[PDB]
């Protein structure tokens, strides 16, 4: 029966491959050759958020596109005011090895996780005003990789246990778990309708999940190595994945396959963080070679390089208005480009 | 703008407080040296952890081991709560001064696995600047094993019979040239991987430890002293 199971799995894989091949009309490059190229894009460093002692893994812009949270391996969750270049808060964590941080859409709460297998939620606008550990979310067996507030009560959290979990901050319990992966899931990105997110794992596959149903709808494969960065196209019907094979892909949920490769020959370093502009034309990708890159999502032609970091860049976020992008890197500096 | 001015002064005061506390934390972060402890289950890394704990407290998966010797305190990190795949969370330990590797010196079956693990550590793109403090643990078990027969390390490693003990040996009075040859053969195996990459930017410091080896914190103390010394010499123009 097991041999029959493998044979029928092969038949289903052949069926999905045939459907993908049939649905492939032409290349996105051919149909976007009627667009004029964007042109060279120069974004100077407006700020250099300089208050971190160790390397920085994650940053997350706020809803107001003014305040942001940055997590460094010293054990701090410094919340800055980008316009004023001021640190409105400096949250002392418990475990210094933090890998993620999330700023809630409302702004009342901030999350952080890491090697402790715990997603800690901090309330900011508390009665006194001193930041405290609001909740301690336990249940992940592997390390913690990416936290993202779905709202003030829930949070989607990826871990090193190949499982994602939709949490309930009010009670501290997993409402529904997303267990369909093979490798360690690193980055997750929520939809504009906050109903279908993706989980980018170390099995060269990103899977699309239902927040309410709790079961994967469509898997997305085609990468050559582990993906540790993922972000939806601003509508929610496409996303991009950055892996260690020095390429960024564009997967289309409607067509259920890859659209275009974003990779040059001279780049041989893995992408660490990806993010789109407010129109979805500037797919910024942070690479291990101490600098970022800017791509034209419709032509794959690289237009702009956000160099300026002395160590590996690890986090990358674009303001909800698209007026800035902050690239926190391992040199403990958050340079806000414009 | 007077209201805006006073509210922004209420922000610069918070910034000043945060700066003061961050300098105070800087006077604590650079005064401690984070250490990372790897190894396998059979390797008695927990015994060394307890021994240096006597010279602090943690039960949340990652067993921190705070210990000070000569008024300087290191911070060991016994991370073991994660899965068997470690190619992604090992990148957090890039700024660690030294990776502590405890190898089970009395296991011939699982010794090639330890060399493979060391080779992976010695060649990571994000670990290629971290010197390793090798710890060949419980040499007493190896001494008992070689001195009782059925210790054909020449079988599991075929290049033992065609091997001779190094001239730069340090034998204890009760030792046997045979157990000395074996225990330096493991060391030379690890240094063979050590002296094959990492062009003068990180070094493997090998040390022999038994089960009850009290002088373990001081050995790491001196090794870290040398590590910091070398990084300062390349940090200056001396090199």
């Amino acid at each position, epitope marked *: 029966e097991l041999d029959q199971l*493998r044979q029928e799995a092969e038949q289903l894989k052949n069926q999905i491959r045939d459907a993908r091949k049939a649905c492939a009309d032409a290349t996105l490059s051919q149909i976007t050759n009627n667009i004029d190229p964007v042109g060279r894009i120069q974004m100077r460093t407006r700020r250099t958020l300089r208050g971190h002692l160790a390397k920085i893994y994650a940053m997350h812009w706020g809803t107001d596109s003014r305040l942001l949270v940055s997590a460094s391996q010293d054990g701090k969750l410094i919340i800055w005011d980008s316009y004023t270049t001021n640190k409105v808060h400096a949250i002392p964590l418990r475990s210094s090895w933090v890998m993620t941080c999330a700023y809630a859409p409302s702004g009342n709460y901030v999350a952080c996780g890491g090697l402790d297998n715990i997603c800690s939620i901090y309330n900011l606008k508390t009665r006194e005003g001193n930041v405290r550990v609001s909740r301690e979310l336990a249940g992940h067996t592997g390390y913690l990789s990416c936290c993202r507030f779905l709202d003030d009560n829930q949070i989607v959290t990826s871990s090193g246990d190949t499982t994602c979990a939709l949490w309930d901050i009010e009670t501290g319990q997993q409402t529904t778990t997303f267990t369909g992966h*093979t*490798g360690d899931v690193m980055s997750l990105s929520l939809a504009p309708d906050t109903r279908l997110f993706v989980s980018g*794992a*170390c*099995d*060269a*596959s990103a899977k699309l999940w239902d927040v309410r149903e709790g079961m994967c709808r469509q898997t997305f*494969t*085609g990468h*050559e*190595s*582990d993906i540790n960065a993922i972000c939806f196209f601003p509508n929610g019907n496409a996303f991009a994945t950055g892996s*260690d*094979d*020095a390429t960024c892909r564009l997967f289309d949920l409607r067509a259920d396959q890859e659209l275009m490769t974003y990779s040059h020959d001279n780049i*041989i370093c*893995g992408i660490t963080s990806v993010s789109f502009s407010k129109s979805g034309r500037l797919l910024l990708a942070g690479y291990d070679d101490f600098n970022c890159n800017v791509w034209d999502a419709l032509k794959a032609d690289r237009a702009g390089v956000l160099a300026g970091h002395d160590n590996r860049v690890s986090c990358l976020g674009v303001t909800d208005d698209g007026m800035a992008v902050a690239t926190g890197s391992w040199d403990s500096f958050l340079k806000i480009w414009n | 703008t007077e209201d805006q001015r006073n509210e922004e002064k209420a922000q610069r005061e918070a910034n000043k407080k945060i700066e003061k506390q961050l300098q105070k934390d800087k006077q604590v972060y650079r005064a401690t040296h984070r250490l990372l402890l790897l190894g396998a289950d059979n390797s008695g890394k927990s015994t060394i952890v307890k021994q240096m704990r006597i010279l602090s407290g943690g039960t949340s998966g990652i067993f921190e081991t705070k210990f000070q010797v000569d008024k300087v305190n290191f911070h060991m990190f016994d991370v073991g709560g994660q*899965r*068997d*795949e*470690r*190619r992604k969370w090992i990148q957090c330990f890039n700024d660690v001064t030294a990776i502590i590797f405890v190898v089970d010196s009395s296991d011939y079956n699982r010794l*090639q*696995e330890a060399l*493979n693990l060391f*080779k*992976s550590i*010695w*060649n*990571n*793109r994000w670990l290629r600047t971290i010197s390793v403090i090798l710890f060949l643990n419980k040499q007493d078990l190896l001494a008992e094993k070689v001195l009782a027969g059925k210790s054909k390390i020449e*079988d*599991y*490693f*075929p290049e033992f019979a065609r091997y001779t003990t190094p001239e730069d040996a340090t034998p204890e009075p009760g030792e046997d040239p045979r157990v000395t040859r074996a225990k330096y053969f493991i060391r030379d195996e690890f240094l063979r991987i050590s002296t094959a*990459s990492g062009d003068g930017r990180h070094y493997c410091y090998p040390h022999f430890t038994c089960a009850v080896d009290t002088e373990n914190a001081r050995r790491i103390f001196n090794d870290c002293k040398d590590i910091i010394l070398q990084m300062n010499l390349r940090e200056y123009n001396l090199v």
Partner: nanobody
Amino acid sequence: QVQLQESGGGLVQPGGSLRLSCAASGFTFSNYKMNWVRQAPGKGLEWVSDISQSGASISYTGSVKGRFTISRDNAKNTLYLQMNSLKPEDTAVYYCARCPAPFTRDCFDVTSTTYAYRGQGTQVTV
């Protein structure tokens, strides 16, 4: 998708010769340090040998050093492991494993839990 399918393998007398082949697919083959991993019956996963991108960093496991000779044909996306003089110890399930990061000389693929880039494997009965 990343698909490493193992061919060869079968009944072996104590001292037979087999051409273990790994028809890999789904990526540019000549960019990864391919390596072999065994699965001894009732025992954990162990490393067999590895070969670099070009074939200049060949390294064998300690136990079987002269019995096994690995060789990759980069233009055929394959990993050969010429296994002659097979002892009963080599009655394991061999696995053709690819290191995750392109252009690197190390990888953590001895993981008992399913490593993402590792084939289904063949059983060689000696």
